[PDB]
Enzyme design. Structure first.
Site, PDB file in Angstrom:
ATOM      1  CD  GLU A  15       8.228   4.386   8.040  1.00 19.28           C
ATOM      2  OE1 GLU A  15       8.487   4.152   6.966  1.00 19.28           O
ATOM      3  OE2 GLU A  15       7.278   4.550   8.410  1.00 19.28           O
TER       4      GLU A  15
ATOM      5  CB  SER B 151      -1.040  -0.146   1.267  1.00 20.25           C
ATOM      6  OG  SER B 151      -0.275   0.001   2.350  1.00 20.25           O
ATOM      7  CB  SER B 152       3.710   2.275   1.834  1.00 18.95           C
ATOM      8  OG  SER B 152       4.496   1.141   1.770  1.00 18.95           O
TER       9      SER B 152
ATOM     10  CB  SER C 167       5.273  25.205   5.706  1.00 22.18           C
ATOM     11  OG  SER C 167       4.765  23.958   4.866  1.00 22.18           O
TER      12      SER C 167
ATOM     13  CG  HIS D 198      17.438   7.623  10.507  1.00 21.84           C
ATOM     14  ND1 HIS D 198      17.314   7.933  11.467  1.00 21.84           N
ATOM     15  CD2 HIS D 198      17.870   8.696   9.499  1.00 21.84           C
ATOM     16  CE1 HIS D 198      17.551   9.331  11.579  1.00 21.84           C
ATOM     17  NE2 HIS D 198      17.686   9.759  10.280  1.00 21.84           N
TER      18      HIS D 198
ATOM     19  CE1 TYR E 120      15.086  13.582   9.805  1.00 23.39           C
ATOM     20  CE2 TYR E 120      15.910  11.233   9.518  1.00 23.39           C
ATOM     21  CZ  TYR E 120      16.001  12.594  10.158  1.00 23.39           C
ATOM     22  OH  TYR E 120      16.966  12.736  10.957  1.00 23.39           O
TER      23      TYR E 120
ATOM     24  CG  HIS F 124      21.630   7.106  13.962  1.00 17.00           C
ATOM     25  ND1 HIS F 124      20.662   6.735  14.898  1.00 17.00           N
ATOM     26  CD2 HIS F 124      21.182   7.786  13.075  1.00 17.00           C
ATOM     27  CE1 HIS F 124      19.655   7.081  14.357  1.00 17.00           C
ATOM     28  NE2 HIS F 124      19.623   7.715  13.069  1.00 17.00           N
ATOM     29  CG  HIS F 125      18.612   3.224  14.847  1.00 21.72           C
ATOM     30  ND1 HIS F 125      17.862   3.550  15.909  1.00 21.72           N
ATOM     31  CD2 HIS F 125      18.465   4.146  13.775  1.00 21.72           C
ATOM     32  CE1 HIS F 125      17.051   4.530  15.528  1.00 21.72           C
ATOM     33  NE2 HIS F 125      17.402   4.846  14.414  1.00 21.72           N
TER      34      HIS F 125
HETATM   35  C1  HEA Z   1      10.160  11.066  13.436  1.00 21.02           C
HETATM   36  C2  HEA Z   1      10.778  10.610  14.395  1.00 21.02           C
HETATM   37  C3  HEA Z   1      11.989  10.788  14.582  1.00 21.02           C
HETATM   38  C4  HEA Z   1      12.849  12.100  14.391  1.00 21.02           C
HETATM   39  C5  HEA Z   1      12.632  13.376  13.495  1.00 21.02           C
HETATM   40  C6  HEA Z   1      14.290  11.746  14.758  1.00 21.02           C
HETATM   41  C7  HEA Z   1      15.519  12.627  14.524  1.00 21.02           C
HETATM   42  C8  HEA Z   1      16.606  12.322  15.068  1.00 21.02           C
HETATM   43  N1  HEA Z   1      17.035  11.023  15.708  1.00 21.02           N
HETATM   44 FE1  HEA Z   1      16.032   9.378  16.044  1.00 21.02          FE
HETATM   45  N2  HEA Z   1      14.728   7.850  16.761  1.00 21.02           N
HETATM   46  C9  HEA Z   1      13.399   7.585  16.419  1.00 21.02           C
HETATM   47  C10 HEA Z   1      12.679   8.803  15.696  1.00 21.02           C
HETATM   48  C11 HEA Z   1      13.015   9.842  15.281  1.00 21.02           C
HETATM   49  N3  HEA Z   1      14.361  10.396  15.291  1.00 21.02           N
HETATM   50  C12 HEA Z   1      12.863   6.659  16.915  1.00 21.02           C
HETATM   51  C13 HEA Z   1      11.446   6.262  16.597  1.00 21.02           C
HETATM   52  C14 HEA Z   1      14.085   5.960  17.370  1.00 21.02           C
HETATM   53  C15 HEA Z   1      14.278   4.606  18.235  1.00 21.02           C
HETATM   54  C16 HEA Z   1      13.952   3.423  17.316  1.00 21.02           C
HETATM   55  C17 HEA Z   1      14.212   2.068  18.280  1.00 21.02           C
HETATM   56  O1  HEA Z   1      15.546   2.235  18.558  1.00 21.02           O
HETATM   57  O2  HEA Z   1      13.449   1.360  18.232  1.00 21.02           O
HETATM   58  C18 HEA Z   1      15.086   6.806  17.078  1.00 21.02           C
HETATM   59  C19 HEA Z   1      16.436   6.565  17.606  1.00 21.02           C
HETATM   60  C20 HEA Z   1      17.543   7.387  17.442  1.00 21.02           C
HETATM   61  C21 HEA Z   1      18.707   6.971  18.101  1.00 21.02           C
HETATM   62  C22 HEA Z   1      19.216   5.936  18.489  1.00 21.02           C
HETATM   63  C23 HEA Z   1      19.783   5.876  19.853  1.00 21.02           C
HETATM   64  C24 HEA Z   1      20.076   4.495  20.714  1.00 21.02           C
HETATM   65  O3  HEA Z   1      19.507   3.800  19.872  1.00 21.02           O
HETATM   66  O4  HEA Z   1      20.442   4.364  21.639  1.00 21.02           O
HETATM   67  C25 HEA Z   1      19.837   8.382  17.547  1.00 21.02           C
HETATM   68  C26 HEA Z   1      21.046   8.285  17.642  1.00 21.02           C
HETATM   69  O5  HEA Z   1      21.670   8.520  16.844  1.00 21.02           O
HETATM   70  C27 HEA Z   1      18.853   9.018  16.981  1.00 21.02           C
HETATM   71  C28 HEA Z   1      19.083  10.337  16.342  1.00 21.02           C
HETATM   72  C29 HEA Z   1      18.280  11.309  15.800  1.00 21.02           C
HETATM   73  C30 HEA Z   1      18.825  12.517  15.385  1.00 21.02           C
HETATM   74  C31 HEA Z   1      20.485  12.817  15.544  1.00 21.02           C
HETATM   75  C32 HEA Z   1      17.746  13.265  14.633  1.00 21.02           C
HETATM   76  C33 HEA Z   1      17.490  14.717  14.111  1.00 21.02           C
HETATM   77  O6  HEA Z   1      16.529  14.564  13.206  1.00 21.02           O
HETATM   78  C34 HEA Z   1      17.211  15.621  14.922  1.00 21.02           C
HETATM   79  C35 HEA Z   1      17.415  16.999  14.427  1.00 21.02           C
HETATM   80  C36 HEA Z   1      16.583  18.197  14.947  1.00 21.02           C
HETATM   81  C37 HEA Z   1      17.456  19.094  15.775  1.00 21.02           C
HETATM   82  C38 HEA Z   1      18.942  18.963  15.996  1.00 21.02           C
HETATM   83  C39 HEA Z   1      16.619  19.968  16.524  1.00 21.02           C
HETATM   84  C40 HEA Z   1      16.383  21.078  15.502  1.00 21.02           C
HETATM   85  C41 HEA Z   1      17.582  21.801  15.134  1.00 21.02           C
HETATM   86  C42 HEA Z   1      18.004  22.870  15.482  1.00 21.02           C
HETATM   87  C43 HEA Z   1      17.445  23.426  16.651  1.00 21.02           C
HETATM   88  C44 HEA Z   1      19.356  23.570  14.991  1.00 21.02           C
HETATM   89  C45 HEA Z   1      20.353  23.882  16.201  1.00 21.02           C
HETATM   90  C46 HEA Z   1      20.712  22.431  16.621  1.00 21.02           C
HETATM   91  C47 HEA Z   1      21.863  22.109  16.511  1.00 21.02           C
HETATM   92  C48 HEA Z   1      22.858  22.971  15.829  1.00 21.02           C
HETATM   93  C49 HEA Z   1      22.344  20.710  16.905  1.00 21.02           C
HETATM   94  N4  HEA Z   1      17.393   8.671  16.920  1.00 21.02           N
HETATM   95  O1  LIG Z   2      15.958   7.250  14.049  1.00 20.54           O
HETATM   96  O2  LIG Z   2      16.436   8.611  14.241  1.00 20.54           O
HETATM   97 CU   LIG Z   3      17.684   6.639  13.181  1.00 20.97          CU
END
Ligand code: HEA
Ligand SMILES: [O-][O-]
Ligand SMILES: [Cu+2]
Ligand SMILES: CCCCCCCCCCCCCCCCCC(=O)OC[C@H](COP(=O)([O-])OCC(O)COP(=O)([O-])OC[C@@H](COC(=O)CCCCCCCCCCCCCCCCC)OC(=O)CCCCCCCCCCCCCCCCC)OC(=O)CCCCCCCCCCCCCCCCC
Ligand SMILES: CCCCCCCCCCCCCCCCCC(=O)OC[C@H](COP(=O)([O-])OCC(O)COP(=O)([O-])OC[C@@H](COC(=O)CCCCCCCCCCCCCCCCC)OC(=O)CCCCCCCCCCCCCCCCC)OC(=O)CCCCCCCCCCCCCCCCC
Ligand SMILES: CCCCCCCCCCCCCCCCCC(=O)OC[C@H](COP(=O)([O-])OCC(O)COP(=O)([O-])OC[C@@H](COC(=O)CCCCCCCCCCCCCCCCC)OC(=O)CCCCCCCCCCCCCCCCC)OC(=O)CCCCCCCCCCCCCCCCC
Ligand SMILES: CCCCCCCCCCCCCCCCCC(=O)OC[C@H](COP(=O)([O-])OCC(O)COP(=O)([O-])OC[C@@H](COC(=O)CCCCCCCCCCCCCCCCC)OC(=O)CCCCCCCCCCCCCCCCC)OC(=O)CCCCCCCCCCCCCCCCC
Ligand SMILES: CCCCCCCCCCCCCCCCCC(=O)OC[C@H](COP(=O)([O-])OCC(O)COP(=O)([O-])OC[C@@H](COC(=O)CCCCCCCCCCCCCCCCC)OC(=O)CCCCCCCCCCCCCCCCC)OC(=O)CCCCCCCCCCCCCCCCC
Ligand code: HEA
Ligand SMILES: [K+]
Ligand SMILES: [Zn+2]
Ligand SMILES: [Zn+2]
Lengths: 99, 107, 49, 180, 47, 121, 61, 91, 90, 65, 459
Positions: K230, K152-153, K243, K228, K232, K277-278
């Site tokens: 996913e 579906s996706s 927006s 990952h 995004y 990074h996971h």
């Molecule tokens: C939509 C959901 C979503 C989003 C957007 C993100 C965004 C990000 N995630 Fe994610 N992440 C998950 C959902 C998400 N994640 C999930 C569900 C898991 C666990 C899955 C599992 O293990 O089962 C996970 C796990 C996960 C881990 C695993 C940790 C571990 O397993 O021990 C890490 C580490 O790298 C990580 C990193 C990040 C980073 C670096 C971002 C970046 O996108 C963040 C970017 C945003 C900012 C940085 C803030 C806004 C920006 C600014 C304010 C600018 C100024 C900031 C700086 C200059 C730093 N994520």
């Molecule tokens: O998963 O970030």
């Molecule tokens: Cu990830």
């Protein structure tokens, strides 16, 4: 109070704003044109002139860090030397050791 | 970046000394939930809904032209709630250029 | 220009944690050297239950 | 003033829960027998025959709308000739009191104002640069620390003892060299 | 060593290896930057 | 400073007070706020000021509370959230007495610095 | 947790230090356990402490 | 609660006839919301939550008193030695 | 251009920027080469960067070092404060 | 036709039968039950009780109830 | 008709309706988890039925990700407004649009039926082998659901990509948001299918990929190569909504439209190359770890640009306009909340910090703040903005300051304490824990029951 009014009048005169150096290409208003709009227009925020903004913002920065120093020197205290570390007898047995 | 339309000083010169900015209210009015009459059936309630569309409203200026309800996106241009078939006549996005051809004019 | 006030407010609040971290490191350096909480020849094996 | 009192009369409180009598007292499921309402139920909703069982999209009640000349009925504009010119008078929507109920008086004033745009191109460009490169600087400030700490974990050390750890369901086995 | 009640332990607690100290300090080093990023952005969330 | 140095075609009010006016207001009632600072029934239009006479671009500012209560109202006549107060009265005062503004800002910052440092330290 | 105990003392000496663990219960069953005791553990613990005292005297020699 | 009439910094600008319109009041009224008891309860409510958010409710303390006296005795008699101000804390 | 506001690049270097499409391509290529070079010229080079007798000592290092050297602080700082574990109990 | 102009005309014109709403809520309620009923069934299957008593897998005081 | 309808706007409504229904099951599972974790002991799950808890957490994750938030933000709002934003009569592929929603429902029925009929065991939503391949038939059923969902996706992604061929207006930022998510799906899904087929081969075809001499870490690479992207694919549609709402409600043209668009493109490319990074704690090579850590921190740059461009949209807006509308509040709350989630993401991105914080509730709170708070609120805000166009009623949400405040406060009560217990440390995917972690777990549990109660007040 005389000195207070003196420095207040000295600051005031120096801070009076000069016309802005427009960074946009706008026309010159026709000569002799008065108030055309009304007060029901969407309010435009009242903004301090650059010199005044720097003065008050600088007073705020000088205030917070002098306040940090006041707290550090008067309200807070320094760590006294750690107590002497003398030899002490440990417990004879772990409480969970089988007998 | 967009900073409004450019203005020449000649265009800011009034034709009378009493000209001020026209004070026309651009608040369309007081509204709430569209209130259907009990007597109206499904067809007549549809007509009622079609007559309560804010995007069909406008404000008439002193010279008879009207400034319409406008939106950044075309999502606000369909009837509310959205009908089954919306843009039967393709919406026209008007672009402007300085090009011209002689056939359009007559001397 | 206002956004600068936020930078300065975020620099002041951040500096508070810098000072806490600074004092933390000083304390850590004195643990193994002077702190009576640090004990050696103290923990004895429990043994299997 | 209370604007609700102006159109209180139009809103007569209801009698039936959900606005329908028990089906026994009146069968709203049946199609209406009124002439010209064969496509509607008694309560006014569209009948299943019209929409499902005999839907025109499925080939039922085939009736092409367009005529021989490729034309369909179109309602003309309200034309008013005047001052040696043919004018069209546009259709103005009814007063919002009729459709919504509140009386259109004492409306707050919201003046016309052109879009609120950010000016000073040079200043704006510098801000946008900062919106991108201030984060970039911070990342670069973390980069060197990240490399160092990664290198520290993966350092060849002169280890003198080995402990082997095996994970099983659900316990941890440990193998250690025995003193000689 | 062991968790204790109602402890924030922000960044970690009770290290017993040089690497454990490293981990705590890495978090502490970045924490003020995180606060700056948050405060500086949130202060401008307004009309 | 929009009216003072940038734009000369908007009406410029007079400051009635560099402090907000505290008033009790009732839901379902409409209030009219003086935008010229010359009314003698502040913060409301008195029927004799510029706003009441529609003179020089001054008009009464319509306002209506959602709930009953005590609300602060603008005395400086330039607050961004006018008729309501949001602190613009103090800001406009600093523009007019920049030396005083510094004193208050230093004092406020001094207190904030001491408390935040004392608690965190 | 020797470093948590050392760091608490250092912080308290410098300024105002407040711990939730000091004021609040750590478990939710506190509302019912005002008078609850384990008497079997009390007897066993007392016996072990007595044996420990004998071992300590022997170790002192 | 029949609030008072505060003239303000410029008393001449409050010297007109208000009629039905409300008269200006002291700022204490704004903080107390005209001494509305429910707003006072709401204010006390705001403090009560914020205290729970940061330091815990502290309303359980009277109930926890006996079990905090037992915890303190155990830490002193059998727990690891505490030094100086550290002896104030029990975990 | 690295860390460069491109508004400045457009103003001061009009002829180099005339073709904005080509200008964009150079932006990508230049930063691609920078990233590639970092890996194979800063990280990869084997058996290099281990000259710890050549630690850079900047002008600020010496300003602060001489200041403390002039006083007794440098000697006091380097002195070992404790080299025993237990204090003597009187 | 005017009745066909709006999608879901009966609902949008506020004439729909309430049963449609009831079915939607019932469907959601059934979906929720798929997490609770198997919990009870599985607990009984492996223990003999539909739900445990708090801390009944640990040592309890004599007067505990 | 009801099931036969091809109208793209009707199908959009179906996606939202089904997301709420399936969402009820998701929230119920979340309540079970938090109830259990209220203290130490067994509370609602027997010690002999611990396998049920493992299944509860597994299904919670899978359903909320693939059957609720993805169908809601990538299927619901997109199918309703995208063809309107594109000034086109209807969606390019009408019949495909119909089958996509039917497929989602059928895969949901399979999953829930497997709860009722199969033995209840769990292996996480990440289905790591060898645990996933030594389980019972419920794992087989879940695999069928995921593969069916994948169909579906992908077909929905194909549908949105075809809008480029027919769009009669300008590609707005929101349209760009969906197109890039569609690209991310077209490139990531085929890899997921392959690794899922290998899980099936080991479960059902006596394959030996996930037994000794076969590297189990292989699965984690291919899974997270989709994993990952996913996260995004789930957030980018939310950004597109934010927006539109900010520009419309503040009556301000989007600032830096091209930078917004190029920020979305950048996040996608970077998000396609940072998956490991996971896998920091598996034992990858030093240079690999440094590459992934470096590129992971880069994603903050484009993500940061979007945040600041949103802030200036709200700045300077007219004061006369009422700012208490629920849609506006939610849009603003998203900026405040997303920054928290992202910053904590950058913290966990440092691998050395990650060693301490992997498989702890700090990770939970991190992705909850972004998804359970940020994504949910974005979907709510988007639906609320389109209330007049959609036409739903019988709810009190549009102007409800109590709901917004209570939701914000209580949602933070649930997940803020989960950051604390991450340094305590309380592992993830566990039900029993030491008695010294009860306080924080109890506080979060009180937050969960409260949030559920607030969901009843909307009706
Ligand atoms: C939509 C959901 C979503 C989003 C957007 C993100 C965004 C990000 N995630 Fe994610 N992440 C998950 C959902 C998400 N994640 C999930 C569900 C898991 C666990 C899955 C599992 O293990 O089962 C996970 C796990 C996960 C881990 C695993 C940790 C571990 O397993 O021990 C890490 C580490 O790298 C990580 C990193 C990040 C980073 C670096 C971002 C970046 O996108 C963040 C970017 C945003 C900012 C940085 C803030 C806004 C920006 C600014 C304010 C600018 C100024 C900031 C700086 C200059 C730093 N994520
Ligand atoms: O998963 O970030
Ligand atoms: Cu990830
Ligand atoms: C001792 C006391 C010393 C006092 C010195 C006062 C100097 C001063 O204010 O000069 C103004 C003075 C103007 O005087 P004036 O008579 O009021 O004239 C004004 C005119 O109307 C028109 O003047 P103009 O057209 O020439 O333009 C001037 C205007 C033009 O303004 C602009 O164009 C805007 C400038 C500001 C833009 C900032 C952009 C930031 C963008 C951030 C983006 C990123 C955000 C996100 C980051 C995320 C990170 C993770 O300048 C300003 O507004 C400057 C404002 C101050 C800027 C300060 C920048 C650094 C921070 C300083 C903070 C305070 C420190 C105090 C310390 C005290 C000691 C402890 O200027 C000059 O004389 C020449 C210029
Ligand atoms: C002298 C007074 C100040 C004393 C201190 C000064 C210290 C030095 C600062 C630098 C120098 C200042 C110089 C200013 C001179 C005046 C210049 C001027 O133009 O004047 C007129 C100008 C206004 O004139 P106007 O525009 O004409 O109109 C008058 C109005 O009053 C319009 O006024 P406005 O709109 O400008 O109003 C100001 C308002 C404007 O801003 C707002 O209202 C924005 C509020 C948005 C809130 C959104 C909701 C947030 C909820 C989050 C909950 C999260 C829970 C879960 C967390 C999980 C974590 C794991 O500011 C605030 O509300 C403060 C917001 C600050 C950031 C908030 C976030 C703090 C985070 C802390 C760390 C957290 C760490 C954990 C979280 C994760 C970290 C990664 O005045 C100002 O610029 C006033 C600025 C005042 C700033 C006060 C800051 C206090 C709060 C500090 C932070 C909180 C903790 C403290 C301990
Ligand atoms: C617990 C028991 C309840 C306590 C309630 C406390 C509420 C506090 C927040 C209120 C809303 C804040 C806000 O954004 O106001 C917008 C408001 C803008 O115009 P507005 O039309 O008055 O507000 C409309 C809002 O929707 C106003 O919201 P609304 O539609 O719900 O209407 C409520 C109305 C009426 O509410 C009240 O009467 C609240 C009275 C609070 C007394 C608290 C006593 C202690 C409780 C513990 O609130 C106001 O008039 C806003 C007053 C804000 C200042 C409160 C006093 C601060 C200390 C002085 O901002 C202000 O007036 C405050 C700006 C203050 C300066 C900020 C920068 C300072 C930097 C240097 C330091
Ligand atoms: C997260 C939650 C909170 C969210 C809060 C935030 C929400 C924000 C707003 C969101 C808005 C989204 C957009 C909304 C757009 C709405 C558009 C719309 O209305 O479309 C029109 C559409 C249809 O209207 P229409 O155009 O008039 O349609 C006419 C029909 O087509 C034709 O009419 P007809 O009468 O001919 O219809 C045929 C009818 C004929 O019906 C009948 O004859 C019914 C007879 C009565 C039966 C009643 C049920 C009986 C159950 C018995 C159970 C016994 C258990 C015994 C246990 C014993 C144990 C010992 O039905 C059928 O024949 C088939 C029914 C199939 C569906 C129902 C399935 C139920 C569950 C089945 C489970 C089976 C499990 C099996 C397992 C087996 C394992 C082996 O409306 C609906 O379908 C209703 C929608 C209502 C809600 C709309 C949204 C309102 C705002 C949100 C409220 C909050 C909701 C929260 C979720 C629910 C919580 C529970
Ligand atoms: C010896 C043997 C030899 C070998 C033999 C081999 C033979 C090989 C045979 C091969 C072929 C076999 C299959 C034939 C299929 C034929 C299809 C066809 O052509 O139909 C035309 C036919 C056209 O009908 P018609 O004759 O023109 O008249 C129909 C009526 O007038 C009604 O008019 P209508 O169509 O307008 O009304 C439909 C609608 C009317 O609407 C309503 O009832 C009220 C409005 C909606 C209420 C709210 C519902 C909840 C919200 C759902 C939102 C998403 C909706 C998405 C779109 C719908 C998807 C179903 O309600 C429904 O019927 C279903 C509504 C949605 C139900 C599901 C909602 C979620 C419930 C979740 C509960 C648990 C959690 O299609 C239908 O109308 C019925 C199709 C039924 C298909 C059922 C498939 C079910 C699969 C379930 C899972 C299976 C695995 C597990 C099962 C476990 C059981 C224990
Ligand atoms: C987007 C997906 C999503 C969402 C919304 C949630 C919401 C919630 N989750 Fe989440 N959760 C996950 C995805 C999600 N979760 C994942 C992927 C895991 C890891 C799985 C694993 O470990 O294997 C996880 C794990 C997880 C655990 C860890 C259990 C464990 O493994 O030990 C816990 C409990 O602490 C928990 C609690 C909650 C709570 C209390 C809520 C919420 O109830 C909080 C309150 C918010 C609401 C009740 C609103 C939600 C409403 C909707 C979602 C409907 C929206 C629909 C429309 C707007 C149309 N979650
Ligand atoms: K438990
Ligand atoms: Zn006046
Ligand atoms: Zn004012």
């Amino acid at each position: 109070a005389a000195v207070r009014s003196q420095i207040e009048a000295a600051v005031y005169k120096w801070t009076r704003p000069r016309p802005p150096r427009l960074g946009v290409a706008v026309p010159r208003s026709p000569p002799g044109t008065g108030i055309l709009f009304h007060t029901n227009m969407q309010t435009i925020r009242y903004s301090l002139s650059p010199k005044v903004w720097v003065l008050v913002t600088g007073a705020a920065l000088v205030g917070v860090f002098s306040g940090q120093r006041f707290a550090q020197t008067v309200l807070l205290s320094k760590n006294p030397p750690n107590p002497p570390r003398y030899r002490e007898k440990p417990p004879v047995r772990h409480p969970h050791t089988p007998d | 970046i967009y900073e409004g339309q450019t203005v020449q000083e000649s265009e800011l010169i009034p034709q009378e000394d009493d000209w001020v900015i026209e004070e026309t209210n651009f608040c369309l009015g007081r509204n709430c939930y569209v209130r259907f009459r009990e007597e109206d059936d499904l067809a007549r309630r549809a007509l009622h809904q079609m007559d309560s569309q804010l995007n069909k409203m406008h404000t008439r200026l002193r010279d008879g032209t009207v400034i319409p309800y406008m939106s950044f996106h075309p999502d606000e241009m369909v009837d509310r709630p959205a009908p089954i078939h919306t843009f039967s006549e393709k919406p026209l996005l008007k672009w402007t250029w300085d090009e011209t051809y002689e056939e359009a004019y007559d001397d | 220009r206002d956004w600068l006030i936020g930078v300065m407010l975020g620099m002041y609040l951040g500096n508070l944690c810098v000072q806490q971290h600074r004092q933390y490191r000083v304390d850590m350096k004195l643990f193994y050297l002077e702190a009576p909480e640090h004990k050696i020849n103290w923990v004895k094996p429990r043994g299997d239950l | 003033k209370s604007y609700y009192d102006d159109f209180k009369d139009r809103l007569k409180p209801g009698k039936y829960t959900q606005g329908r009598c028990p089906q026994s007292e009146g069968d709203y499921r049946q199609e209406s027998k009124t002439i010209g309402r064969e496509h509607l139920n008694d309560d006014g909703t569209r009948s299943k025959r019209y929409t499902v069982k005999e839907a025109d999209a499925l080939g039922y009640h085939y009736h092409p709308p367009i005529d021989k000349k490729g034309q369909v009925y179109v309602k003309g504009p309200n034309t008013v000739i005047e001052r040696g010119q043919t004018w069209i008078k546009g259709y103005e929507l009814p007063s919002m009191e009729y459709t919504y109920g509140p009386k259109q008086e004492d409306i707050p004033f919201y003046p016309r104002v052109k879009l609120n745009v950010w000016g000073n191109y040079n200043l704006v460009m510098k801000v946008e640069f900062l919106f991108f490169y201030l984060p970039t600087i911070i990342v670069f400030g973390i980069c060197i620390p990240v490399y160092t700490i990664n290198f520290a974990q993966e350092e060849v050390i002169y280890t003198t003892m080995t402990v082997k750890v095996t994970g099983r369901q659900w316990y941890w086995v440990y193998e250690v060299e025995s003193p000689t | 060593d062991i968790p204790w009640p109602a402890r924030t332990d922000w960044g970690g607690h009770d290290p017993a290896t040089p690497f454990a100290e490293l981990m705590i300090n890495t978090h502490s080093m970045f924490w003020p930057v995180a606060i700056f990023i948050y405060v500086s952005a949130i202060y401008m969330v307004k009309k | 400073t929009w009216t003072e140095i940038w734009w000369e075609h908007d009406p410029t009010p007079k400051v009635a007070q560099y402090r907000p006016y505290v008033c009790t207001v009732e839901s379902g009632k409409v209030y009219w706020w003086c935008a010229c600072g010359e009314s003698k029934t502040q913060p409301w239009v008195d029927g004799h000021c510029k706003c009441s006479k529609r003179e020089g671009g001054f008009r009464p500012r319509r306002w209506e509370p959602e709930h009953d209560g005590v609300r602060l109202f603008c005395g400086c006549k330039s607050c961004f959230s006018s008729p309501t107060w949001n602190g613009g009265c103090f800001t406009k005062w600093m523009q007019s007495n920049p030396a005083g503004g510094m004193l208050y800002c230093f004092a406020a910052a001094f207190g904030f610095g001491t408390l935040t440092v004392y608690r965190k330290f | 947790n020797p470093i948590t105990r050392y760091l608490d003392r250092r912080r308290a000496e410098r300024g105002p230090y407040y711990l939730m663990s000091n004021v609040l219960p750590y478990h939710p069953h506190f509302l019912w356990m005002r008078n609850s005791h384990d008497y079997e553990a009390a007897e066993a613990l007392a016996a072990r402490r007595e044996k420990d005292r004998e071992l300590a005297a022997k170790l002192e020699a | 609660y029949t609030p008072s009439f505060e003239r303000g910094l410029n008393p001449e600008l409050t010297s007109g006839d208000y009629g039905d319109m409300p008269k200006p009041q002291p700022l204490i009224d704004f903080f107390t919301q005209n001494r509305n008891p429910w707003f006072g309860f709401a204010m006390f409510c705001g403090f009560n939550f914020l205290w729970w958010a940061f330091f815990g409710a502290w309303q359980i303390r009277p109930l926890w008193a006996s079990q905090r006296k037992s915890l303190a005795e155990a830490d002193r008699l059998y727990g690891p030695t505490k030094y100086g101000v550290g002896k104030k804390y029990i975990n | 251009s690295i860390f460069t506001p491109m508004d400045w690049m457009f103003y001061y270097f009009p002829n180099y920027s005339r073709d904005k499409v080509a200008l964009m391509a150079r932006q990508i290529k230049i930063h691609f080469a920078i990233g590639f070079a970092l890996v194979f010229l800063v990280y990869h080079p084997p058996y290099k960067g281990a000259d710890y007798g050549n630690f850079h000592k900047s002008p600020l290092y010496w300003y602060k070092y001489n200041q403390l050297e002039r006083s007794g602080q440098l000697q006091e700082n380097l002195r070992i404060k404790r080299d025993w574990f237990y204090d003597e109990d009187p | 036709n005017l009745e066909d102009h709006f999608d879901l005309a009966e609902y949008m014109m506020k004439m729909h039968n309430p049963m449609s709403e009831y079915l939607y809520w019932i469907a959601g309620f059934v979906s929720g039950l798929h997490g609770i009923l198997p919990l009870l069934h599985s607990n009984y299957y492996f223990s003999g009780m539909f739900l445990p008593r708090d801390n009944d897998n640990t040592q309890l005081c004599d007067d505990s109830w | 008709f009801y099931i036969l309808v091809n109208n793209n706007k009707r199908i959009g409504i179906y996606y939202i309706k089904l997301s709420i229904i399936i969402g009820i099951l998701g929230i119920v599972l979340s309540y079970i988890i938090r109830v259990e974790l209220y203290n130490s002991g067994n509370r609602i799950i027997k010690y002999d039925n611990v396998n049920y808890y493992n299944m509860v957490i597994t299904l919670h994750g899978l359903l909320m990700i693939f059957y609720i938030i993805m169908p809601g933000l990538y299927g619901g709002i997109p199918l309703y407004i995208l063809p309107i934003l594109s000034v086109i009569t209807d969606i390019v592929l009408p019949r495909i649009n119909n089958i996509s929603i039917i497929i989602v429902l059928i895969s949901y029925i399979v999953v829930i039926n497997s709860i009722v009929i199969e033995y209840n065991i769990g292996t996480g939503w990440t289905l790591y082998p060898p645990l996933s391949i030594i389980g019972t038939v419920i794992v087989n059923m879940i695999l069928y659901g995921l593969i069916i969902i994948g169909i579906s996706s992908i077909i929905s992604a194909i549908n949105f990509m075809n809008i480029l061929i027919v769009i009669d207006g300008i590609i707005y930022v929101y349209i760009w948001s969906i197109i890039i998510t569609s690209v991310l799906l077209i490139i990531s899904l085929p890899i997921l299918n392959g690794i899922l087929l290998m899980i099936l081969s080991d479960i059902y075809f006596n394959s030996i990929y996930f037994i000794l001499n076969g590297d189990v870490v292989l699965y984690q690479h291919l899974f997270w190569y989709f994993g990952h992207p996913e996260v995004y694919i789930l957030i980018l549609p939310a950004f597109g909504i934010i927006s539109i709402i900010l520009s419309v409600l503040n009556n301000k043209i989007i600032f830096g439209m091209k930078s917004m668009i190029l920020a979305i493109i950048m996040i996608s490319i970077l998000g396609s190359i940072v998956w490991a990074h996971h896998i920091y704690t598996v034992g990858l090579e030093l240079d690999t770890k440094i590459y992934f850590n470096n590129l992971t921190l880069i994603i903050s740059i484009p993500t940061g640009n979007k945040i600041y461009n949103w802030i200036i949209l709200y700045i300077g807006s007219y004061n006369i306009l009422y700012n208490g509308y629920q849609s506006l509040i939610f849009s603003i709350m998203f900026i405040i909340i997303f920054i928290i989630g992202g910053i904590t993401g950058i913290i966990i991105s440092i691998d050395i910090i990650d060693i301490g914080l992997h498989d702890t509730y700090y990770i939970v709170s991190h992705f909850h703040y972004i998804l359970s708070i940020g994504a949910v609120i974005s979907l709510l805000a988007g639906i609320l903005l389109l209330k007049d166009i959609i036409g739903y009623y019988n709810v009190i949400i549009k102007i409800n300051k109590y709901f917004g405040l209570l939701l914000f406060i209580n949602i933070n009560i649930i997940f803020t304490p989960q950051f604390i217990i991450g340094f305590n440390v309380m592992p993830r995917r566990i039900l029993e824990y030491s008695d010294n972690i009860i306080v924080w777990n109890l506080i979060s549990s009180i937050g969960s029951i409260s949030t559920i109660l607030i969901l009843l007040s909307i009706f």
